[PDB]
Write an enzyme that holds these catalytic residues in place. Structure first.
Site: not given
Length: 330
Positions: A199, A35
């Site tokens: 992004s 994770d």
């Protein structure tokens, strides 16, 4: 040194991925959920409330000659999805794909929430975010990667998750045969303890690319792609009959649909998520309504590039003095 381990989807929908991890002496192999959005290595154990164990493999520290109770240490974690676990702490030898760390903090669960109990295939979590998020008190502990880093050939790990197939976690090297083209690297902020990056935009299907900054985290421990409501609405508007359902808890779409791809930007590069990756199947057994793999992050407080996005790429988690993230197509 290096390590390399295969990671395997737990079910037909890629709801999560499990990776075998050797703990203790002699080795006890548990299947852990790696994770990159958390920083605790915790396991079902011989200490876990009996009624809360249902099929998991447990760590028994009394059977490990290298296990040592970390005196006075406890831990307690609550995840964004509402699940939780807590317990005490041992140090022991932990190996992943041939890479060994001695004196790793192994957090032994005394309590786990219902969602963990109900998932027989996940024996615990191995956190790969920054150690500043580790919940051990009163002395915070380091992640497996943090402990291994100095010994690695290069201070990196990579995630290469498969779509409906096994994939790979590598430590200490970049497998140049595992991706196509080049790896595009992008800046990371560690301010919130995550692999947080920005992004450069998105496209829906064959549509034009929208240049827009989307701050979010690279999180292998989250199944879906969570993005701003504007972006998510633009995606689902391209799917006939798709709608946001309050009763179901997100966007659903007709199971008869063919889904468009979703592209996200990494600098000037582009990662394309095929439409099939965005199908999470019937909302309930036999239903013709299917759950979408792209959902709104409104209410979460952060955007999450979870498995739906990451499995479309070869992802480099670069843990150099100034960390960065790399993405390549594959």
């Amino acid at each position: 040194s290096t390590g390399s381990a295969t990671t395997t989807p737990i079910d037909s929908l890629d709801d999560a991925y499990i990776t075998p991890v050797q703990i203790g002496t002699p080795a006890q192999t548990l299947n852990l959920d790696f994770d990159t959005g958390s920083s605790d290595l915790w396991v079902f154990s011989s200490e876990t409330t009996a009624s809360e164990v249902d099929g998991q493999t447990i760590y028994t520290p009394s059977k490990s000659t290298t296990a040592k109770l970390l005196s006075g240490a406890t831990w307690s974690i609550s995840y964004g999805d509402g699940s939780s676990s807590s317990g005490d702490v041992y140090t022991d030898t932990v190996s992943v794909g041939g890479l060994t760390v001695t004196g790793q903090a192994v957090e032994s669960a005394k309590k786990v929430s219902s969602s963990f109990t109900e998932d027989s295939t996940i024996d615990g979590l191995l956190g790969l975010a920054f150690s500043t998020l580790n919940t051990v008190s009163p002395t915070q502990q380091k992640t497996f990667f943090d402990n291994a880093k100095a010994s690695l050939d290069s201070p990196v790990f990579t995630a290469d998750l498969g779509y409906h197939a096994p994939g790979t976690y590598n430590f200490g090297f970049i497998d140049t045969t595992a991706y196509t083209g080049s790896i595009t690297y992008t800046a990371v902020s560690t301010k919130q303890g995550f692999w947080e990056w920005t992004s450069t935009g998105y496209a829906v299907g064959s549509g034009t690319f929208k240049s827009t900054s989307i701050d979010g985290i690279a999180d292998t421990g989250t199944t879906l792609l969570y993005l701003p409501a504007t972006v998510v609405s633009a995606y689902w508007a391209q799917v006939s009959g798709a709608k946001s359902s309050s009763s179901v808890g997100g966007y659903v779409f007709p199971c008869s649909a063919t889904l468009p791809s979703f592209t996200f930007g990494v600098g000037s590069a582009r990662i394309v998520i095929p439409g099939d990756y965005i199908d999470f199947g019937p909302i309930s057994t036999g239903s013709s309504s299917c759950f979408g793999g792209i959902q709104s992050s409104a209410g979460i407080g952060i955007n999450i590039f979870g498995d739906v996005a990451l499995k479309a790429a070869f992802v480099v988690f670069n843990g150099a003095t100034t960390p960065t993230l790399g993405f390549a197509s594959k």
